[model samples]
Target: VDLSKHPSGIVPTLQNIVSTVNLDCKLDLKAIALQARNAEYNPKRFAAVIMRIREPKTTALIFASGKMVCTGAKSEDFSKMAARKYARIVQKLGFPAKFKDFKIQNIVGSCDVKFPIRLEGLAYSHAAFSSYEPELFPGLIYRMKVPKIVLLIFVSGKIVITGAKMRDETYKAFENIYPVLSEFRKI
Candidate 1:
């Protein structure tokens, strides 16, 4: 909805949301793995027990310290839903798990401008905020200070925004960069 000026109707879509919740109690990773059908634990490789839910198609890493990390949700609400589902699974497994400190750690979104960008010129002009090395990485990294968001701009007009704790931050970063991107549009 923010792309009203561009007219192409292109807008950023949330790719992934990573969130964490504290269970507020000690957990037994082994017991959880054996109890939950969609759970797996391999202490030899990782210390946390991995759990999955089909509804949200998300995965949760449950640690013995009662801290859980849920990832792969496309929306913030879905992320919290999957997290609560994970905590419920732990609760049904006989652990006095309390959902506490639920926080969204990162939100990733991407969109296409539909017009090629002159990344070289952009990096040269915005040297303080942008970095581009074609040999090392094709995309130019633009770090915005106000929203504290990082974006990867490619010559193909593909833009990826990350390091956003809230969805609005991603939209704000994109809105702030759209005008700058238009200035560097390749004709």
Candidate 2:
């Protein structure tokens, strides 16, 4: 929560952020703020919080307006690639083009370790699409399992990629899963 206590020495690179979250590690929130201040700006905004969680293996980063951008992963390049896709998806959903917009958002990147849960069933549908069902169904719940890590990106462009010792794991995961999910619709 209070990131100031945890100080990641280097500037928060996309890879660092992912690794931090994957390890459920903490970071210096102030340092993140300082680094983010220097980050390239597509659209500038204030970041509220930057912290890591491990139970589910994730990083929870929040913004001042209560919006969050989480990324720390062990599987594919979850935060880097998946987060971007999520932003595009939000744009497709008619939200603002900026990746920083969302309400109580959360993103997760899963490793090759499968959790015996039906991610594409009624329960997930009901929870994720409570207001926008039918239209949100079928398309919203996309699932896949790969030999490499997998990135479970959330709507807010934040990501969690799992499955490798480093960032390259994401590419491996993507290569393995993309084809499978692409073909899943045909089944």
Candidate 3:
């Protein structure tokens, strides 16, 4: 397939990356939450320690099982960098935090087709894996089961692809779905 002939050829810009890393030891959530300036923990509300850093402008969910989840970076490398920074923050707080098993859990991408969409037609045509409840939400929820990805599509041609672990998955998903979407294209 000639890539440029497809609407998906316009690669979507990554909006967010979610990743995780094992710190290799138990964590005293209270201690770090109380000590660190950017850390927060509320046992009654949530179990994980929420920590934020300014450089990559990402937040982390630090758990007692030495597990941490980092979110909000636009790139994979930057996301890893953010993870390391979070671990260092815990280390500086007096724990022997070691960064291990770093993994990319999810990636999000967004793009526009520069035109409106026949969402009602799309929803009806792709009903097997699509849901549209305009009263509750404006966009249609398209669940792409093969890649296990979810897409939020609006009538305005704006789309958000999520639940992808690799950037290529994001691209591949759009590549597979755009043709179906163009069939229901609003004209």
Candidate 4:
């Protein structure tokens, strides 16, 4: 067996974990704008707000600019994993995690939408979805009624996917949105 194909070689991060996901559906821009407006009005209630939606699937936002928030996570494990990954990143980047007190902040605001398909006799509802643990290769999973039409948003400028029918779907979703966010880079 090739070691390259094994999970042992993988290093998980928010960027690497969602690299393959594609966003092919149309988003309700008006709804997203409303949510962003609300977040801005009550910035204290949110860790981040969407500054712009460059495209239907892509958005720009800020994080850790103020009090942070982490919400809608399904379990404590999810939060723990996030904290651990962030701590490792900070330490790797020369920030001392031991000296830096990092907190898992509340998730202030989020934008969400339902899957695109509406099959006969099958009800489509966003609330019916259930969050799944990320894959061994470092991707989050979600099980929703429609296999397509995933919802992606930022909580404190950190990207998070709220809906995906499978692990691969989550990966594809991110790939579609990343380019729009690239312009925000200083370099």
How much is the lDDT of residue 18 in candidate 3?
A: 97
Best by TM-score: 1
Which segments of model 1 are wrong by more than 4 Å? 2-10
Count backbone overlaps in model 1: 0
Off-target runs (Cα >4 Å) in candidate 4 are 1-147
> Taking the tens digit of each residue's C-alpha lDDT, what string does model 1 give over 51-80?
899989999999999999999999999999
Error of 2 at 123 (Å): 14
RMSD of 1: 2.0
TM-score of every candidate relative to the true structure: 0.93, 0.24, 0.92, 0.22
Q: Which is the better candidate, 1 or 4, if ranked by TM-score?
A: 1
2 or 3, which is superior by lDDT? 3
lDDT for 157 (candidate 4) = 30
Question: What local distance difference test score does each model get?
Answer: 0.92, 0.37, 0.89, 0.32
Report the alpha-carbon TM-score of model 1 versus the true structure: 0.93
- As a whole number from 0 to 100, the lDDT of residue 109 in candidate 3 is 97
Measured by TM-score, how close is model 3 to the native structure? 0.92
